[PDB]
Design an enzyme around this catalytic site. Structure first.
Site, PDB file in Angstrom:
ATOM      1  N   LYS A  13      61.865  45.478  33.356  1.00 56.74           N
ATOM      2  CA  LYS A  13      62.626  43.230  33.632  1.00 56.74           C
ATOM      3  C   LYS A  13      62.902  41.862  32.738  1.00 56.74           C
ATOM      4  O   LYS A  13      63.696  41.932  33.223  1.00 56.74           O
ATOM      5  CB  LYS A  13      61.437  43.297  34.580  1.00 56.74           C
ATOM      6  CG  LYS A  13      62.228  45.132  36.227  1.00 56.74           C
ATOM      7  CD  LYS A  13      61.276  44.808  37.189  1.00 56.74           C
ATOM      8  CE  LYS A  13      59.912  43.572  37.277  1.00 56.74           C
ATOM      9  NZ  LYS A  13      59.258  45.494  38.071  1.00 56.74           N
ATOM     10  N   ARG A  88      59.067  44.713  46.240  1.00 55.08           N
ATOM     11  CA  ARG A  88      58.463  45.569  45.582  1.00 55.08           C
ATOM     12  C   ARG A  88      57.581  47.312  46.859  1.00 55.08           C
ATOM     13  O   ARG A  88      57.254  47.628  46.484  1.00 55.08           O
ATOM     14  CB  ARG A  88      57.374  45.964  44.702  1.00 55.08           C
ATOM     15  CG  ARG A  88      56.205  44.895  44.774  1.00 55.08           C
ATOM     16  CD  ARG A  88      56.008  44.036  42.860  1.00 55.08           C
ATOM     17  NE  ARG A  88      55.533  45.811  41.726  1.00 55.08           N
ATOM     18  CZ  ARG A  88      55.720  44.942  40.785  1.00 55.08           C
ATOM     19  NH1 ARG A  88      56.010  44.006  39.847  1.00 55.08           N
ATOM     20  NH2 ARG A  88      55.305  45.934  39.589  1.00 55.08           N
ATOM     21  N   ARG A 127      52.723  47.315  24.067  1.00 52.55           N
ATOM     22  CA  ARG A 127      53.407  45.926  24.326  1.00 52.55           C
ATOM     23  C   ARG A 127      52.943  44.230  23.725  1.00 52.55           C
ATOM     24  O   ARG A 127      51.356  44.833  24.336  1.00 52.55           O
ATOM     25  CB  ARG A 127      54.098  45.384  25.610  1.00 52.55           C
ATOM     26  CG  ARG A 127      54.194  44.593  26.444  1.00 52.55           C
ATOM     27  CD  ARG A 127      54.184  43.328  27.869  1.00 52.55           C
ATOM     28  NE  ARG A 127      53.946  44.134  28.416  1.00 52.55           N
ATOM     29  CZ  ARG A 127      54.343  44.322  29.911  1.00 52.55           C
ATOM     30  NH1 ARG A 127      55.298  42.960  30.419  1.00 52.55           N
ATOM     31  NH2 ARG A 127      52.779  44.379  30.633  1.00 52.55           N
ATOM     32  N   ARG A 160      48.226  42.273  27.310  1.00 52.69           N
ATOM     33  CA  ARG A 160      48.181  41.862  28.417  1.00 52.69           C
ATOM     34  C   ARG A 160      47.187  42.598  29.778  1.00 52.69           C
ATOM     35  O   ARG A 160      47.362  43.716  28.753  1.00 52.69           O
ATOM     36  CB  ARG A 160      49.056  42.161  29.476  1.00 52.69           C
ATOM     37  CG  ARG A 160      49.572  40.552  30.551  1.00 52.69           C
ATOM     38  CD  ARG A 160      51.037  41.001  31.149  1.00 52.69           C
ATOM     39  NE  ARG A 160      50.935  41.799  31.952  1.00 52.69           N
ATOM     40  CZ  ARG A 160      52.215  42.610  32.768  1.00 52.69           C
ATOM     41  NH1 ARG A 160      53.767  41.587  32.515  1.00 52.69           N
ATOM     42  NH2 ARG A 160      51.907  43.385  34.091  1.00 52.69           N
ATOM     43  N   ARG A 171      48.742  51.241  37.660  1.00 52.81           N
ATOM     44  CA  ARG A 171      50.558  50.941  38.266  1.00 52.81           C
ATOM     45  C   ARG A 171      50.998  51.777  38.576  1.00 52.81           C
ATOM     46  O   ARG A 171      51.852  51.503  39.410  1.00 52.81           O
ATOM     47  CB  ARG A 171      50.916  49.907  37.117  1.00 52.81           C
ATOM     48  CG  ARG A 171      50.002  48.438  37.180  1.00 52.81           C
ATOM     49  CD  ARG A 171      49.422  48.232  35.432  1.00 52.81           C
ATOM     50  NE  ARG A 171      50.599  47.406  35.196  1.00 52.81           N
ATOM     51  CZ  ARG A 171      50.701  46.823  33.959  1.00 52.81           C
ATOM     52  NH1 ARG A 171      50.223  46.888  33.239  1.00 52.81           N
ATOM     53  NH2 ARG A 171      52.437  46.518  33.382  1.00 52.81           N
TER      54      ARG A 171
HETATM   55  N1  LIG Z   1      65.376  48.869  26.010  1.00 51.69           N
HETATM   56  C1  LIG Z   1      64.437  49.021  25.591  1.00 51.69           C
HETATM   57  N2  LIG Z   1      63.658  50.274  24.848  1.00 51.69           N
HETATM   58  C2  LIG Z   1      62.317  50.043  24.646  1.00 51.69           C
HETATM   59  N3  LIG Z   1      61.659  49.846  25.041  1.00 51.69           N
HETATM   60  C3  LIG Z   1      61.397  48.370  24.990  1.00 51.69           C
HETATM   61  C4  LIG Z   1      63.151  48.438  26.092  1.00 51.69           C
HETATM   62  N4  LIG Z   1      63.228  46.783  26.798  1.00 51.69           N
HETATM   63  C5  LIG Z   1      62.113  46.476  26.347  1.00 51.69           C
HETATM   64  N5  LIG Z   1      61.257  46.994  26.146  1.00 51.69           N
HETATM   65  C6  LIG Z   1      59.590  46.928  25.531  1.00 51.69           C
HETATM   66  O1  LIG Z   1      58.633  47.367  26.728  1.00 51.69           O
HETATM   67  C7  LIG Z   1      57.848  46.822  27.387  1.00 51.69           C
HETATM   68  C8  LIG Z   1      58.214  46.644  28.105  1.00 51.69           C
HETATM   69  O2  LIG Z   1      59.322  45.458  28.602  1.00 51.69           O
HETATM   70  P1  LIG Z   1      58.969  44.449  29.897  1.00 51.69           P
HETATM   71  O3  LIG Z   1      60.154  43.902  29.648  1.00 51.69           O
HETATM   72  O4  LIG Z   1      57.908  43.113  29.330  1.00 51.69           O
HETATM   73  O5  LIG Z   1      58.544  44.952  30.926  1.00 51.69           O
HETATM   74  P2  LIG Z   1      58.896  44.835  32.519  1.00 51.69           P
HETATM   75  O6  LIG Z   1      59.745  45.414  33.606  1.00 51.69           O
HETATM   76  O7  LIG Z   1      58.774  43.520  32.652  1.00 51.69           O
HETATM   77  O8  LIG Z   1      56.363  45.046  32.114  1.00 51.69           O
HETATM   78  P3  LIG Z   1      55.736  44.562  33.196  1.00 51.69           P
HETATM   79  O9  LIG Z   1      54.548  45.006  33.282  1.00 51.69           O
HETATM   80  O10 LIG Z   1      56.271  43.374  33.260  1.00 51.69           O
HETATM   81  O11 LIG Z   1      56.324  44.498  34.555  1.00 51.69           O
HETATM   82  P4  LIG Z   1      55.278  44.547  35.800  1.00 51.69           P
HETATM   83  O12 LIG Z   1      55.944  45.342  37.404  1.00 51.69           O
HETATM   84  O13 LIG Z   1      54.675  46.444  35.796  1.00 51.69           O
HETATM   85  O14 LIG Z   1      54.294  43.533  36.842  1.00 51.69           O
HETATM   86  P5  LIG Z   1      54.162  42.660  36.857  1.00 51.69           P
HETATM   87  O15 LIG Z   1      54.121  41.479  35.404  1.00 51.69           O
HETATM   88  O16 LIG Z   1      55.599  42.147  37.632  1.00 51.69           O
HETATM   89  O17 LIG Z   1      53.476  42.234  37.854  1.00 51.69           O
HETATM   90  C9  LIG Z   1      52.011  42.917  37.467  1.00 51.69           C
HETATM   91  C10 LIG Z   1      51.366  42.900  38.918  1.00 51.69           C
HETATM   92  O18 LIG Z   1      51.344  41.652  39.869  1.00 51.69           O
HETATM   93  C11 LIG Z   1      51.764  41.902  41.410  1.00 51.69           C
HETATM   94  N6  LIG Z   1      52.825  41.939  41.476  1.00 51.69           N
HETATM   95  C12 LIG Z   1      53.644  41.456  41.003  1.00 51.69           C
HETATM   96  N7  LIG Z   1      54.657  41.397  41.908  1.00 51.69           N
HETATM   97  C13 LIG Z   1      53.964  41.454  42.862  1.00 51.69           C
HETATM   98  C14 LIG Z   1      55.178  41.779  44.449  1.00 51.69           C
HETATM   99  N8  LIG Z   1      56.269  41.743  44.617  1.00 51.69           N
HETATM  100  N9  LIG Z   1      53.791  42.410  45.143  1.00 51.69           N
HETATM  101  C15 LIG Z   1      52.770  42.669  45.515  1.00 51.69           C
HETATM  102  N10 LIG Z   1      51.980  42.487  44.080  1.00 51.69           N
HETATM  103  C16 LIG Z   1      53.176  42.021  43.085  1.00 51.69           C
HETATM  104  C17 LIG Z   1      51.174  43.871  40.804  1.00 51.69           C
HETATM  105  O19 LIG Z   1      49.369  43.726  41.018  1.00 51.69           O
HETATM  106  C18 LIG Z   1      51.657  44.005  39.608  1.00 51.69           C
HETATM  107  O20 LIG Z   1      50.730  45.606  39.260  1.00 51.69           O
HETATM  108  C19 LIG Z   1      57.693  45.517  25.880  1.00 51.69           C
HETATM  109  O21 LIG Z   1      57.042  45.965  24.985  1.00 51.69           O
HETATM  110  C20 LIG Z   1      59.198  46.113  25.512  1.00 51.69           C
HETATM  111  O22 LIG Z   1      59.332  45.113  23.991  1.00 51.69           O
HETATM  112 MG   LIG Z   2      58.081  41.762  33.210  1.00 55.57          MG
END
Ligand SMILES: Nc1ncnc2c1ncn2[C@@H]1O[C@H](COP(=O)(O)OP(=O)(O)OP(=O)(O)OP(=O)(O)OP(=O)(O)OC[C@H]2O[C@@H](n3cnc4c(N)ncnc43)[C@H](O)[C@@H]2O)[C@@H](O)[C@H]1O
Ligand SMILES: [Mg+2]
Ligand SMILES: [Zn+2]
Length: 216
Positions: A13, A88, A127, A160, A171
């Site tokens: 994302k 989500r 990552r 992270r 997760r």
């Molecule tokens: N095409 C490709 N091919 C190969 N490799 C690639 C690629 N594209 C990218 N990559 C690589 O892949 C890796 C990942 O890519 P990256 O782009 O970093 O991925 P991402 O989808 O953004 O990953 P996140 O870990 O940041 O998402 P998340 O939903 O788990 O957690 P979030 O921060 O939102 O949320 C964290 C926490 O917050 C809380 N939270 C957030 N939102 C809510 C909500 N709405 N409700 C309740 N709790 C919430 C929860 O506790 C949650 O766990 C990188 O190393 C990148 O270089």
């Molecule tokens: Mg992210």
């Protein structure tokens, strides 16, 4: 241009969102980022969310919806927005419907970045993130020119706290059970768009851009 980005942990994302905001200038709104920013500053919101985030669990709906409602109301969302990681849960999606109905801003597309759960563990443990800018790299798939530092600003890269095997697994478990209902929810709405997230970064975005060009 009102967009929502969804996908399992590590689906990309942030990576894809970075391009969208660059080509269209809409605010990138990531609840995960907002929560971590709060945690760093130690705001009451940050401390409450921390307990859940550190365990890989979802932060409660009420407080999450609350901060999102406030954010989508800012002036910078006039020409659209890019929600990342929200909603989500079906409850959050239903709540977002009300919120956007009050703001007069309907969702144009819910973009689901589909990636097999089986390769997400590798994506996350490998990552590394810019401590200065937030952009992400991957030790194998998208490494920085100079290890340990960001290509853009020279800032140190970090891992992270929730990007370890155990928490990553939790997760995936937590979000996988929310996935199909969200898909069904927006599939019924009529604007769910599936994008193949298992390809080269720019090729993933090409599929995203095709949808966005119809939103000026
Ligand atoms: N095409 C490709 N091919 C190969 N490799 C690639 C690629 N594209 C990218 N990559 C690589 O892949 C890796 C990942 O890519 P990256 O782009 O970093 O991925 P991402 O989808 O953004 O990953 P996140 O870990 O940041 O998402 P998340 O939903 O788990 O957690 P979030 O921060 O939102 O949320 C964290 C926490 O917050 C809380 N939270 C957030 N939102 C809510 C909500 N709405 N409700 C309740 N709790 C919430 C929860 O506790 C949650 O766990 C990188 O190393 C990148 O270089
Ligand atoms: Mg992210
Ligand atoms: Zn950086």
């Amino acid at each position: 241009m009102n967009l929502v980005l969804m996908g399992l942990p590590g689906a990309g994302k942030g990576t894809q969102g970075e391009r969208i905001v660059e080509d269209y200038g809409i605010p990138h709104i990531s609840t995960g980022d907002m929560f971590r920013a709060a945690m760093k500053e130690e705001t009451p919101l940050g401390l409450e969310a921390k307990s859940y985030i550190d365990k890989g669990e979802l932060v409660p709906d009420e407080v999450t919806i609350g901060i999102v409602k406030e954010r989508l109301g800012k002036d910078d969302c006039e020409r659209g927005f890019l929600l990342d990681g929200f909603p989500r849960t079906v409850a959050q999606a239903e709540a977002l419907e009300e919120i956007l109905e009050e703001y007069g801003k309907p969702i144009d597309y819910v973009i689901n970045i589909e990636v097999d759960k089986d390769v997400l563990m590798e994506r996350l443990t490998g990552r590394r993130i810019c401590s200065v800018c937030g952009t992400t790299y991957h030790l194998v798939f998208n490494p920085p020119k100079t290890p340990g530092i960001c290509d853009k600003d020279g800032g140190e890269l970090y891992q992270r706290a929730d990007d370890n095997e155990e928490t990553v697994s939790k997760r995936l478990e937590v979000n996988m059970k929310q996935t199909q209902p969200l898909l069904d929810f927006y599939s019924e709405k009529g604007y769910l768009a599936n994008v193949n997230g298992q390809r080269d970064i720019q090729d993933v975005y090409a599929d995203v851009k095709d949808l966005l060009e119809g939103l000026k």
